[PDB]
């Protein structure tokens, strides 16, 4: 795919002069996004070492010409007409995953129905990914982006990585809190994505954050060994701000984040039986 080569002055100008205060959208992906209004659409502006930062640029330009489907952000444009480089989306309304299950600024809390979907969704599009043999190294419930719908739209391709076993790298990237045991030494596998995956469903399941410092276990993905060492059970976790969770789909989903994270890489389900699994819990 070829896309729009937008001018950097109207970027500036849509989005009233890349503003800081809320509605700026968020921020994360080593750079700012911002709302805006181009070619009569609501867009995304993504302004964001200097040589490190174009690589995460290029990347994501790459993999979004290669990979299209109905949950993966779609990249409208980008602009290189100065050294403050900038990537338009098409606009998520519902923002991220993270924030809707936070009811950050006051949003209601999601429907285990919503939910469902939304991973089924989330599977998809990893799928996706992994057949077309790339690895997205970030997968997060901050990277899963929701439109008019709720359907789930994976985002952030800049540490994107294609495959077109076993690789290891130098510069160790992504976040600690989803991050695999082989990731934080360095291989590069898209088993990481499944097990980063297997966190996103606990957090789909009990509204709790990947990590809390004033929290115990201040990781969420300990909860896993709580549950299994029969302390307490997935129904003492599940998120109260829901009416519509029923205990079977509920543990349905548990033992496929149960699975994704497993500790050895070689004993996880491939992405293809992830989605096939979530597919059955609805159905
Ligand atoms: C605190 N919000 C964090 C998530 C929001 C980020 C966000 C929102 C959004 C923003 C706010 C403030 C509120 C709502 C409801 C939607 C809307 N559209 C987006 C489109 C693309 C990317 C993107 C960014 N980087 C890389 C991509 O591939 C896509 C991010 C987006």
């Given at each position: 795919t070829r896309f729009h080569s937008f001018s950097f002055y109207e970027?500036?100008?849509?989005?009233?002069?890349?503003?800081?205060?809320?509605?700026?959208?968020?921020?994360?992906?080593?750079?700012?996004?911002?709302?805006?209004?181009?070619?009569?659409?609501?867009?995304?502006?993504?302004?964001?070492?200097?040589?490190?930062?174009?690589?995460?640029?290029?990347?994501?330009?790459?993999?979004?010409?290669?990979?299209?489907?109905?949950?993966?952000?779609?990249?409208?444009?980008?602009?290189?007409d100065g050294d403050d480089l900038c990537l338009v989306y098409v606009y998520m309304p519902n923002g991220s995953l993270?924030?809707?299950?936070?009811?950050?600024?006051?949003?209601?809390?999601?429907?285990?129905?919503?939910?469902?979907?939304?991973?089924?969704?989330?599977?998809?599009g990893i799928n996706f990914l992994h057949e077309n043999h790339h690895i997205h190294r970030d997968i997060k419930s901050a990277n899963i982006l929701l439109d008019e719908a709720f359907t789930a739209k994976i985002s952030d391709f800049g540490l994107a990585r294609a495959s077109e076993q076993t690789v290891m790298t130098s510069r160790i990237v992504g976040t600690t809190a989803y991050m695999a045991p082989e990731a934080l030494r360095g291989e590069i596998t898209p088993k990481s994505d499944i097990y980063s995956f297997g966190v996103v469903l606990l957090e789909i399941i009990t509204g709790l954050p990947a990590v809390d410092e004033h929290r115990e276990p201040q990781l969420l993905?300990?909860?896993?060994?709580?549950?299994?060492?029969?302390?307490?059970?997935?129904?003492?976790?599940?998120?109260?701000?829901?009416?519509?969770?029923?205990?079977?789909?509920?543990?349905?989903?548990?033992?496929?984040?149960?699975?994704?994270?497993?500790?050895?890489?070689?004993?996880?389900?491939?992405?293809?039986?992830?989605?096939?699994?979530?597919?059955?819990?609805?159905?």
């Open positions: 970027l500036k100008n849509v989005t009233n002069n890349f503003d800081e205060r809320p509605i700026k959208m968020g921020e994360g992906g080593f750079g700012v996004v911002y709302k805006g209004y181009v070619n009569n659409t609501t867009v995304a502006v993504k302004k964001l070492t200097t040589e490190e930062l174009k690589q995460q640029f290029d990347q994501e330009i790459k993999v979004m010409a290669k990979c299209q489907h109905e949950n993966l952000v779609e990249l409208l444009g980008f602009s290189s993270l924030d809707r299950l936070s009811c950050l600024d006051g949003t209601p809390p999601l429907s285990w129905h919503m939910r469902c979907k939304i991973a089924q969704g989330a599977a998809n993905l300990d909860i896993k060994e709580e549950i299994e060492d029969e302390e307490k059970t997935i129904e003492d976790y599940i998120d109260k701000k829901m009416n519509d969770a029923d205990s079977t789909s509920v543990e349905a989903m548990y033992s496929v984040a149960s699975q994704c994270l497993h500790e050895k890489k070689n004993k996880r389900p491939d992405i293809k039986k992830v989605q096939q699994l979530l597919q059955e819990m609805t159905a």
